[PDB]
Amino acid sequence: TTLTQSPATLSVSPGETATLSCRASQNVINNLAWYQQKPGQAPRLLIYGASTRATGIPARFSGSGSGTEFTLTISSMQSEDFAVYYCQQYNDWPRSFGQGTRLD
Amino acid sequence: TTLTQSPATLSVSPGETATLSCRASQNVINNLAWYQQKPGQAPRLLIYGASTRATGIPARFSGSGSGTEFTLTISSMQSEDFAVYYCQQYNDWPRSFGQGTRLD
Amino acid sequence: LSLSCTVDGESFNGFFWTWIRQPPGKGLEWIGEINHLASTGYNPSLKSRVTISVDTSKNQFSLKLTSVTAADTAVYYCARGYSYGFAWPNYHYLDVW
Amino acid sequence: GTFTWTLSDPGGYCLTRWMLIEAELKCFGNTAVAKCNEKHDEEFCDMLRLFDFNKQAIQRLKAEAQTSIQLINKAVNALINDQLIMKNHLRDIMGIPYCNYSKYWYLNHTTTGRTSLPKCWLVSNGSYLNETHFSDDIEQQADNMITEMLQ
Amino acid sequence: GTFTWTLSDPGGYCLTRWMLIEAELKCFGNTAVAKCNEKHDEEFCDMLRLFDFNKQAIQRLKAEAQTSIQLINKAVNALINDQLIMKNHLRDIMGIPYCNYSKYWYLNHTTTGRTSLPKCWLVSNGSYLNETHFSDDIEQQADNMITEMLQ
Amino acid sequence: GTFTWTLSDPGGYCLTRWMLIEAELKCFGNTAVAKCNEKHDEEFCDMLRLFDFNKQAIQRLKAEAQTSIQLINKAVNALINDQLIMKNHLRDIMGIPYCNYSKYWYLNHTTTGRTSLPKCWLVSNGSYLNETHFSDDIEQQADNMITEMLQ
Amino acid sequence: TSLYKGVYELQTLELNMETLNMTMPLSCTKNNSHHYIMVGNETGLELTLTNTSIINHKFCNLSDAHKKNLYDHALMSIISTFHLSIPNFNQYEAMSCDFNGGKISVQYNLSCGTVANGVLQTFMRMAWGGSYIALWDCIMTSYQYLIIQNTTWEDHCQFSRPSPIGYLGLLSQRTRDIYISRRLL
Amino acid sequence: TSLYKGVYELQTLELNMETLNMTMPLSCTKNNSHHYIMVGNETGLELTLTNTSIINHKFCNLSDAHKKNLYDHALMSIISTFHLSIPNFNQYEAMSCDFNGGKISVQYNLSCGTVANGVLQTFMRMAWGGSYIALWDCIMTSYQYLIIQNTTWEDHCQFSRPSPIGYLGLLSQRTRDIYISRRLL
Amino acid sequence: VQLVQSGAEVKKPGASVKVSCKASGYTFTKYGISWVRQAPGQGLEWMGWISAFNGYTRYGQRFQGKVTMTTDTSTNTASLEVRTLTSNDTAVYYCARQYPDQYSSSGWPRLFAMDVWGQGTTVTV
Amino acid sequence: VQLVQSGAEVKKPGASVKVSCKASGYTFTKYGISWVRQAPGQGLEWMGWISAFNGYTRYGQRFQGKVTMTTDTSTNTASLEVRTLTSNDTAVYYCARQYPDQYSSSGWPRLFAMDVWGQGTTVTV
Numbered sequence A, B: 001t002t003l004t005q006s007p008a009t010l011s012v013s014p015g016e017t018a019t020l021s022c023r024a025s026q027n028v029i030n031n032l033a034w035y036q037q038k039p040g041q042a043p044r045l046l047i048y049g050a051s052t053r054a055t056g057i058p059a060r061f062s063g064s065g066s067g068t069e070f071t072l073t074i075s076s077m078q079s080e081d082f083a084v085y086y087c088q089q090y091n092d093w094p095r096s097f098g099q100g101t102r103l104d
Numbered sequence C: 001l002s003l004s005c006t007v008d009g010e011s012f013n014g015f016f017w018t019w020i021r022q023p024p025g026k027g028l029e030w031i032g033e034i035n036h037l038a039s040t041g042y043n044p045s046l047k048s049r050v051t052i053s054v055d056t057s058k059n060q061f062s063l064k065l066t067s068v069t070a071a072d073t074a075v076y077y078c079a080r081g082y083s084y085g086f087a088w089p090n091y092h093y094l095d096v097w
Numbered sequence D, E, F: 001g002t003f004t005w006t007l008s009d010p011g012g013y014c015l016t017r018w019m020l021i022e023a024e025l026k027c028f029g030n031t032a033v034a035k036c037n038e039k040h041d042e043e044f045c046d047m048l049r050l051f052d053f054n055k056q057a058i059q060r061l062k063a064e065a066q067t068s069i070q071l072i073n074k075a076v077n078a079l080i081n082d083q084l085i086m087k088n089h090l091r092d093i094m095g096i097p098y099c100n101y102s103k104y105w106y107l108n109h110t111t112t113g114r115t116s117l118p119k120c121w122l123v124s125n126g127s128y129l130n131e132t133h134f135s136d137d138i139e140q141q142a143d144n145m146i147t148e149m150l151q
Numbered sequence G, H: 001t002s003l004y005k006g007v008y009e010l011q012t013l014e015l016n017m018e019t020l021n022m023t024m025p026l027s028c029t030k031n032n033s034h035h036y037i038m039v040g041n042e043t044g045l046e047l048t049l050t051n052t053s054i055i056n057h058k059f060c061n062l063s064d065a066h067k068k069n070l071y072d073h074a075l076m077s078i079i080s081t082f083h084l085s086i087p088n089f090n091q092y093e094a095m096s097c098d099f100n101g102g103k104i105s106v107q108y109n110l111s112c113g114t115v116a117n118g119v120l121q122t123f124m125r126m127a128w129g130g131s132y133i134a135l136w137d138c139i140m141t142s143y144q145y146l147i148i149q150n151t152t153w154e155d156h157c158q159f160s161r162p163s164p165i166g167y168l169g170l171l172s173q174r175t176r177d178i179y180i181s182r183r184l185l
Numbered sequence I, J: 001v002q003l004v005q006s007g008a009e010v011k012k013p014g015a016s017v018k019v020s021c022k023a024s025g026y027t028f029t030k031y032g033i034s035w036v037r038q039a040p041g042q043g044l045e046w047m048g049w050i051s052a053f054n055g056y057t058r059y060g061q062r063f064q065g066k067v068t069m070t071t072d073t074s075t076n077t078a079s080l081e082v083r084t085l086t087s088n089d090t091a092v093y094y095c096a097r098q099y100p101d102q103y104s105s106s107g108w109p110r111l112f113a114m115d116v117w118g119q120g121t122t123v124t125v
């Protein structure tokens, strides 16, 4: 399955919420992962499952949605929240990532 | 049920194997018994069930067969193997015995 | 036209036994088709006046065409053909004549 | 033919806010859930299996014309025990309080939070029975909970 | 599905003088009746459920025209297990002693008075098997309840 | 209903060379067979009951015209649980690994020689699952059986 | 808020059967006369007990209805399950049907040990939960006709909550009390 | 070879269903189109999916077949079980049959929620374990005809092993999803 | 485990023969005794079987009434009594230990053969 | 818990490249290793996943043959190698830790994502 991220660019100043959308080709029931990659650094797992945060992840990042449509929301975007966000399904093989989104 | 032993006489020399056959009137599932009677002594149990050997019986005596056809094989013939061998069914009452085969 | 086509050959089951007529100067024309069962297929143009039967015991099939006419004079062939419908390239070929 | 559906998920089962009216998320532990896979005479277990099957059917499969009576007709006996509702019908006929499948009751530990397997609330004369008339059953449930706590 | 009928009434079940022939009232304790609610292959339990259902239907429901075939056809599967009588039918076919649900045997503790769950008497040639030919079985039964006496 | 067939014979069950492909005789102890008389959701128990019924029917009954569909139609419900294969079919429908009753796996103690009750192997993509994708199930089975043998 | 044994508190919960749509039909009762069984959030069957009949002809065009595949398959399956579950049905003249245009409309004449008894048994086994108002069993009622029609979904039932128990119950006892009409079936 | 917790070894076994051939039918698949249901070590039914039909009429005449007791009773029982298990079957013209001479030949003519869906579901349950290669449910296939005929026993189980699971599965679901065609059945 | 059959008796025809064997080395109650007759020059013939536990008897088709079997648990003995003798009644009589056949509801029949035999008693008329 | 990917290196195109990631801080047998490729300026691309417990490999559709991945439990390492380097093969390779997917007869599948990643290894042709 191939999944796409429609916005691909969020030019938002710090302080307000940001929303990212992920759409999958087929049904992926609550088996989606959201990763964050700092410039030049390795990606880190932010959200595993539909709406479950990884250990040590601040409660600012919230996942929602299911099936085909998923959303990731950042409430109070801080200085360190500027990174590239990636969407990966793992409901079936092979694992497929998204084209990414540049959030500045 | 009436069961008969077809050969009834084997003038077999010592050293080679001997084969005895038993045929039952009706179905007798693995419920046969082979007894050995030396001349002048009471019969003793050699084989009970399908092929299970009685306690202390040498491995040369071996039973086989189920249903109606049954076979008893003696691999090595010794001096004391020459006796009268009897075939009994115990699948129903009354118990029935064969005519016996004299091994000489 | 009571025309029978007795064949021994290979097995009689699983084949389509057809009749094809060719009028002089024109092309071929399929006019009937029979399976080893009682099922049949006919040419719509002349279906109303043709009838083909099959006898499995004698291994033969016979065509009958009523209302004989000199306009129906032609050359008639009885043919065996096999149709394959299990995979993609479905194909039907008139095996022997 | 005994049912074979096993409940999804540590080891307990959680009823979401959608499966409950006028209530939030509820959750039952492993001990209570484990009784649903062994006993053939629990109405709550049957309804819980029905809800789990509905959720799994919605998630795994597609939707078209909502005419999914064939699916439930194929798998009606793999989720519930028809003789349970048959027995409830017999009890209703004989003028005895029966198991209307709407309301359930259970015992909560004040501090530990352990919860017994819910039992359905009996109804009679089209009105729910009041706990002064089945207090003995509640005491029996409390005794069983204490005995299980001992081991 | 499985049976869901529960036996009425400390905790045992007593068969009245009408449920037996040439015998008086006979009671069985809680430890034996309690096995009737989990065992799927007990013949005495099925027959005792049938007797209890008959008694309750006579007591509560009205009697008229005696056309109660609909009632028994409606709730036949909530009282007995059809595969048990099917197994008995197959055992009868294969020329093996079977059970026609008429006679039962049990073990008494002479001093204590506690008994075991009755098991039905096997039949051959249209005659009951005699105690020697299943004596081993009886032995096993004793051993079992001896273990039950340990706790 | 519920199956009532009891496996033949200390107390274990031995599958002959004919019942297996490219394998010799294999025996399972009483501690594993005893589970087959109480559980309702074990593939291997139903298959063992089918094999035992086939063997007993061959031994104790005649054969003619090969029209034995009558016997299996009569006795199908006394050997297997239909809702179990219904559950397998449902799991196949939802795109989840299932079991077609062909391959089984079990745990052997190297020294003692005691074995667990075999669990049937899972198939996905019409192919047998590799061991790495159900290892947690193997560990859970080993833990349960070590707990059983501890007591 | 009584405390049992000094350590246990009694709490209750209620199940929302209305979220079980799209997989199971849900049956519930509006009042004495009107009862409903709904499929999806689109369709349903309305069962009414009336002294007024809507069909006067003694016809049932079942074969013709099957030939013209215009009705809803789910509703036809439900009505087939209902009809097959009637115990000891032998008066075929007491059931009238209308299937013209794809709609379904069934009328049962209830005018013991009669057809009305079995029809009421099946009815209150279907609409189990609120049908007890119009009550061995030998059921008798003052109503003369039972009418089953199709309707669109609406917030109809206010006497009892929706529940799939009745349909799931009559599913088991489907072909269990049918008489034989022919030597070969 | 891995040793779980250093003391237990994982071992596997595979059953041999072919030894059950005097008591139960055994179903297997040859390829995408050919499937077999063997009874005994002499008899079998062949299931095929084709663009090509073999019956051109619409005469599934059964009273004559029953009158002339020439067919194999086991095969007739199997095909009756298959036909009864079809859910929501109402297009009778989609089924054609030929039983003359004691043989049995059945053709289901498959050209959502149609007769093809029900026939394919019943076929998938019958040929369970190897029919998934010919795939809510809404099963649709490119084939136009399903053909059931006679075969003698032969080594055909080369894609899936023989198994009595499918036939034992459709025994339970036999008359559960049949429409009513008459008031007095 | 052996059995002794009390010598050999010779009596005139028409009298009653009382031949007994005592079993030592095992619990006499568990196993019954089966009687076998071997005519001089012919094969073995089955007479009957008596279970020592409550003394339950099964006789042969032709030996019913002609011969009786009794048991004594105090002396651990099993006895066979023949009413009338005849020229064809001369034979050798053996008594053999046999476990009673076992039946159960949850199980299959378990049938047994004659485990051990005692030396025969020669009865000549 | 961290994974070190043996630094980085560059080589002439047309030759084979080898990169290894060494795991530590956890049981290397329980969790398998997935390999991700990121082209310069492009998104992440998945290549394969190897289970260390028995070393079971699942490969990408377009990476079969060209990419070979192995595991070594003795030193707790996962190695990857590419036969024919190409202009588009210049990228950064990431070693991620993934728990094997679990299925059971009584239960539902439990799928897993890449929890712990490692610092990437750059390869330029």
Ligand SMILES: *[C@@H]1O[C@H](CO)[C@@H](O[C@@H]2O[C@H](CO)[C@@H](O[C@@H]3O[C@H](CO[C@H]4O[C@H](CO)[C@@H](O)[C@H](O)[C@@H]4O)[C@@H](O)[C@H](O[C@H]4O[C@H](CO)[C@@H](O)[C@H](O)[C@@H]4O[C@H]4O[C@H](CO)[C@@H](O)[C@H](O)[C@@H]4O)[C@@H]3O)[C@H](O)[C@H]2NC(C)=O)[C@H](O)[C@H]1NC(C)=O
Residues within 6 Å of the ligand: E100, E101, E102, E123, E126, E127, E128
């Ligand atoms: C499960 O399987 C077992 C195994 O066989 C089976 O047991 C058998 O049950 C039957 C049915 O009861 C038993 O048959 C009874 O036998 C008694 C005893 O008969 C002896 O005595 C008579 C003389 O009285 C002799 O002629 C005979 O040969 C025997 O020596 C009979 O007395 C019974 O008949 C009476 O009861 C019937 C019940 O309706 C009457 O219909 C019948 O007319 C008899 O009644 C007469 O006498 C009464 C007393 O005097 C009097 O009150 C009446 O008015 C009338 O005048 C009956 O035939 C059989 O013996 C059992 N077998 C064994 C080995 O015990 C179970 O029945 C079976 N269960 C099921 C459910 O299938």
Ligand SMILES: *[C@@H]1O[C@H](CO)[C@@H](O[C@@H]2O[C@H](CO)[C@@H](O[C@@H]3O[C@H](CO[C@H]4O[C@H](CO)[C@@H](O)[C@H](O)[C@@H]4O)[C@@H](O)[C@H](O[C@H]4O[C@H](CO)[C@@H](O)[C@H](O)[C@@H]4O[C@H]4O[C@H](CO)[C@@H](O)[C@H](O)[C@@H]4O)[C@@H]3O)[C@H](O)[C@H]2NC(C)=O)[C@H](O)[C@H]1NC(C)=O
Residues within 6 Å of the ligand: F100, F101, F102, F123, F125, F126, F127, F128, H128, H129, H130, H155, H156, H157, H158, H159, H160, H161, H162, H163
């Ligand atoms: C549950 O689900 C599982 C997974 O889907 C499924 O497993 C599959 O079972 C089938 C059973 O038929 C397996 O198919 C067999 O595969 C072997 C191996 O094939 C290799 O060798 C052949 C050459 O023979 C190569 O062409 C091939 O590419 C492979 O390298 C085949 O050999 C089998 O065919 C033989 O046996 C058949 C038995 O009837 C014969 O009909 C057939 O003609 C072949 O006979 C040959 O061998 C005979 C001796 O055995 C000999 O006498 C003949 O003359 C001839 O030489 C067969 O096709 C399949 O591999 C399994 N899949 C996996 C992944 O393991 C279960 O079957 C399923 N259980 C159910 C449905 O109950």
Ligand SMILES: *[C@@H]1O[C@H](CO)[C@@H](O[C@@H]2O[C@H](CO)[C@@H](O[C@@H]3O[C@H](CO[C@H]4O[C@H](CO)[C@@H](O)[C@H](O)[C@@H]4O)[C@@H](O)[C@H](O[C@H]4O[C@H](CO)[C@@H](O)[C@H](O)[C@@H]4O[C@H]4O[C@H](CO)[C@@H](O)[C@H](O)[C@@H]4O)[C@@H]3O)[C@H](O)[C@H]2NC(C)=O)[C@H](O)[C@H]1NC(C)=O
Residues within 6 Å of the ligand: D100, D101, D102, D123, D126, D127, D128, G128, G129, G130, G155, G156, G157, G158, G159, G160, G161, G162, G163
């Ligand atoms: C198990 O057995 C129990 C009891 O035997 C049974 O529970 C009963 O279920 C019925 C049906 O749900 C309940 O009836 C409801 O009662 C409430 C409250 O009653 C009063 O409400 C107001 C005061 O608040 C009074 O004015 C009124 O006259 C009643 O006296 C009603 O509010 C319900 O009506 C609403 O809901 C219906 C269904 O949704 C609608 O059809 C109806 O029009 C009403 O909706 C309107 O108001 C809503 C807000 O209130 C609004 O959202 C809507 O849009 C609309 O405007 C309903 O009549 C009854 O109370 C339960 N208890 C008892 C003791 O009878 C179970 O049904 C049974 N289980 C099964 C499976 O059958």
Ligand SMILES: *[C@@H]1O[C@H](CO[C@@H]2O[C@@H](C)[C@@H](O)[C@@H](O)[C@@H]2O)[C@@H](O[C@@H]2O[C@H](CO)[C@@H](O[C@@H]3O[C@H](CO[C@H]4O[C@H](CO)[C@@H](O)[C@H](O)[C@@H]4O)[C@@H](O)[C@H](O[C@H]4O[C@H](CO)[C@@H](O)[C@H](O)[C@@H]4O)[C@@H]3O)[C@H](O)[C@H]2NC(C)=O)[C@H](O)[C@H]1NC(C)=O
Residues within 6 Å of the ligand: F128, F129, F130, F131, F132, H001, J054, J055, J056, J057
């Ligand atoms: C579950 O997956 C397991 C992992 O298998 C890997 O992934 C699959 C998809 C394949 O790519 C496979 O090649 C991978 O290894 C799988 O276990 C593995 O199965 C293979 C084949 O069945 C085994 O290969 C054979 O190994 C033996 C030697 O085994 C011993 O040595 C190894 C290495 O020291 C140990 O790890 C083992 O435990 C043993 O101690 C070789 O002799 C044999 O060679 C034969 O084949 C070659 C090539 O055709 C010929 O040239 C030779 O002449 C021989 O004929 C194989 O190479 C592999 O050892 C095994 N690994 C482990 C760790 O068990 C397992 O089978 C799967 N389970 C299933 C499918 O049910």
Ligand SMILES: *[C@@H]1O[C@H](CO[C@@H]2O[C@@H](C)[C@@H](O)[C@@H](O)[C@@H]2O)[C@@H](O[C@@H]2O[C@H](CO)[C@@H](O[C@@H]3O[C@H](CO)[C@@H](O)[C@H](O[C@H]4O[C@H](CO)[C@@H](O)[C@H](O)[C@@H]4O)[C@@H]3O)[C@H](O)[C@H]2NC(C)=O)[C@H](O)[C@H]1NC(C)=O
Residues within 6 Å of the ligand: C085, C086, C087, C088, C090, H050, H051, H111, H141, H142, H143, H144
């Ligand atoms: C059985 O019959 C069906 C349909 O039969 C037809 O329709 C019925 C309603 C009825 O009227 C019949 O009398 C009538 O004959 C067959 O269905 C076919 O399904 C295939 C699917 O592969 C279709 O073929 C594809 O069509 C594509 C464009 O629409 C085309 O791009 C595909 O090309 C591919 O293959 C070529 C060759 O390998 C390759 O070079 C290409 O690059 C590409 O990959 C392909 O041709 C047919 O059009 C369908 N026929 C129709 C719709 O009439 C069915 O195949 C047939 N057989 C079986 C076994 O079921």
Ligand SMILES: *[C@@H]1O[C@H](CO[C@@H]2O[C@@H](C)[C@@H](O)[C@@H](O)[C@@H]2O)[C@@H](O[C@@H]2O[C@H](CO)[C@@H](O[C@@H]3O[C@H](CO)[C@@H](O)[C@H](O)[C@@H]3O)[C@H](O)[C@H]2NC(C)=O)[C@H](O)[C@H]1NC(C)=O
Residues within 6 Å of the ligand: B092, B093, B094, E125, E126, E127
């Ligand atoms: C099983 O098979 C037969 C059947 O037994 C008979 O039929 C049953 C339905 C019951 O009614 C039994 O009580 C009945 O006996 C058994 O054969 C039977 O053996 C008995 C031996 O006592 C015969 O009785 C004798 O009959 C003769 C002639 O009439 C009298 O002179 C005797 O005094 C005595 O009464 C009985 O006739 C006979 N059955 C038949 C039909 O002839 C058989 O023994 C039994 N199998 C076993 C292993 O016990």
Ligand SMILES: *[C@@H]1O[C@H](CO[C@@H]2O[C@@H](C)[C@@H](O)[C@@H](O)[C@@H]2O)[C@@H](O[C@@H]2O[C@H](CO)[C@@H](O[C@@H]3O[C@H](CO)[C@@H](O)[C@H](O)[C@@H]3O)[C@H](O)[C@H]2NC(C)=O)[C@H](O)[C@H]1NC(C)=O
Residues within 6 Å of the ligand: D125, D126, D127
């Ligand atoms: C069994 O139930 C009936 C009827 O129950 C009624 O319907 C149920 C669905 C519930 O909603 C009940 O709450 C409801 O009452 C009982 O008969 C009815 O009892 C009530 C009182 O319990 C009567 O109400 C009275 O009405 C008079 C005026 O007529 C007032 O002055 C009173 O203050 C009181 O409100 C009601 O009239 C009566 N009849 C009907 C048709 O509702 C019945 O008592 C109960 N118990 C038994 C043993 O039958």
Ligand SMILES: *[C@@H]1O[C@H](CO[C@@H]2O[C@@H](C)[C@@H](O)[C@@H](O)[C@@H]2O)[C@@H](O[C@@H]2O[C@H](CO)[C@@H](O[C@@H]3O[C@H](CO)[C@@H](O)[C@H](O)[C@@H]3O)[C@H](O)[C@H]2NC(C)=O)[C@H](O)[C@H]1NC(C)=O
Residues within 6 Å of the ligand: H059, H060, H061, H064, H097, H098, H099, H100
């Ligand atoms: C299934 O069985 C019928 C036979 O039963 C037919 O229908 C009944 C209701 C009665 O009306 C019967 O009298 C009648 O035969 C098969 O249909 C029949 O096939 C025969 C073939 O020999 C047809 O006979 C022909 O009749 C014409 C005159 O109409 C003669 O000129 C012909 O020489 C020939 O005898 C008969 O017409 C036909 N009946 C109908 C109604 O079409 C049917 O074919 C059979 N199906 C299969 C698959 O065998």
Ligand SMILES: *[C@@H]1O[C@H](CO)[C@@H](O[C@@H]2O[C@H](CO)[C@@H](O[C@@H]3O[C@H](CO)[C@@H](O)[C@H](O)[C@@H]3O)[C@H](O)[C@H]2NC(C)=O)[C@H](O)[C@H]1NC(C)=O
Residues within 6 Å of the ligand: D058, G018, G019, G020, G021, G022, G040, G041
């Ligand atoms: C039929 O049953 C389905 C459930 O199977 C009901 O659908 C559910 O409807 C509720 C109310 O509209 C939905 O709740 C909503 O949830 C979202 C979050 O997802 C929330 O943001 C909204 O404010 C609202 O509360 C629920 O999601 C929905 N479930 C599904 C699976 O769609 C439906 O209402 C039932 N239909 C009838 C006629 O009863």
Ligand SMILES: *[C@@H]1O[C@H](CO)[C@@H](O[C@@H]2O[C@H](CO)[C@@H](O[C@@H]3O[C@H](CO)[C@@H](O)[C@H](O)[C@@H]3O)[C@H](O)[C@H]2NC(C)=O)[C@H](O)[C@H]1NC(C)=O
Residues within 6 Å of the ligand: F058, H018, H019, H020, H021, H022, H040, H041
């Ligand atoms: C149908 O099933 C039966 C068994 O259920 C199959 O028959 C069996 O065939 C094997 C040989 O393949 C027989 O084994 C034989 O055992 C004797 C024992 O002495 C040995 O001497 C022989 O050499 C041979 O190994 C087995 O007895 C036999 N079972 C029977 C007859 O009940 C049969 O092959 C199956 N049918 C098909 C078509 O596969």
Ligand SMILES: *[C@@H]1O[C@H](CO)[C@@H](O[C@@H]2O[C@H](CO)[C@@H](O)[C@H](O)[C@H]2NC(C)=O)[C@H](O)[C@H]1NC(C)=O
Residues within 6 Å of the ligand: G071, G100, G101, G102, G103, G104, G150, G151, G152
């Ligand atoms: C009962 O069902 C019938 C058949 O679907 C309905 O009649 C059709 O309804 C649809 C939906 O409005 C219309 O598009 C068709 O034109 C109607 N056909 C005919 C012949 O009338 C009917 O409306 C349903 N009854 C109710 C009360 O909704």
Ligand SMILES: *[C@@H]1O[C@H](CO)[C@@H](O[C@@H]2O[C@H](CO)[C@@H](O)[C@H](O)[C@H]2NC(C)=O)[C@H](O)[C@H]1NC(C)=O
Residues within 6 Å of the ligand: H070, H071, H072, H101, H102, H103, H104, H150, H151, H152
């Ligand atoms: C389908 O069944 C028919 C009838 O049983 C088979 O035809 C008979 O087969 C037997 C066995 O070879 C012959 O003795 C008869 O003479 C046949 N009768 C007729 C009328 O042909 C038929 O062979 C079976 N189908 C297949 C393909 O074998």
